[PDB]
Amino acid sequence: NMKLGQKVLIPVKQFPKFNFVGKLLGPRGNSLKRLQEETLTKMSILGKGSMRDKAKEEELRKSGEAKYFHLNDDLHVLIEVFAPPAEAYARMGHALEEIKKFLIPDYN
Amino acid sequence: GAINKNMKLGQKVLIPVKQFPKFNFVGKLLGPRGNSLKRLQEETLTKMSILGKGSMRDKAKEEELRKSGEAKYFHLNDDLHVLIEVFAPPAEAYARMGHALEEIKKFLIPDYN
């Protein structure tokens, strides 16, 4: 068994008005949690703008604690997997395909 | 990274030489009758190279290259392995890697064929 991790950009700069976080979570907040289970991965929204309170986010980023280093990156989904190699890579490929629709706007 | 942007992946697969020191792993992968590594690359859309200690079967040259300190020979410091590489968009890169990792398994299990 091995761990894989892959960041996937949430393209905020490119589409600054689209509610990506709401798209990812769905109206009940369940959607990303469900998708991680469907693909046998773990998926977390990390990076700048990923905390609810902007001021706290800046404090945490300035703290320099390792657990907040992610706050220096652009907003992203981190997909992680732990499985035997062939299966780890397959799960990641599946997750990467499934996440696509949530990372582009669905209206102009 | 961006979901659509082509990316490189690389993954080492150990060849179990110490466990099976009389079995010719390399010959079987490279032999002209099987063309087995070539075929595996084509079927999986990955690229594969045999690297690490013993990958040259010219032990003296291998040592000289290891001792040269040239970056292209750093791999000689690792145990014998297949390096599987791919360049594709992320979803496809990972899926192709997974297919390659499944398909290589049969070459790493010694039998009498």
Author numbering:
A (entry chain A): 53 to 160
B (entry chain B): 48 to 160
Question: What is written in the article reporting this PDB entry?
Answer:
The KH domain of T-STAR adopts a classical type-I KH fold very similar to KH structures of other STAR proteins. A comparison of free and RNA-bound structures of T-STAR show that the presence of the QUA1, QUA2 and the RNA do not induce any global structural changes of the KH domain (backbone RMSD ranging between 0.44 and 1.05 Å). Surprisingly, the KH domain and the C-terminal half of the QUA1-KH linker of T-STAR provide an additional dimerization interface. This novel KH/linker interface covers 1,065 Å2 per monomer, almost twice as large as the QUA1 dimerization interface, and involves mainly the C-terminal α-helix 3 of the KH domain and the C-terminal half of the QUA1-KH linker. The KH interface is stabilized by a network of hydrophobic interactions involving residues A138, Y141, M144, G145 and L148, and an intermolecular hydrogen bond between Y141 in α-helix 3 and Q58 in β-strand 1 of the KH.
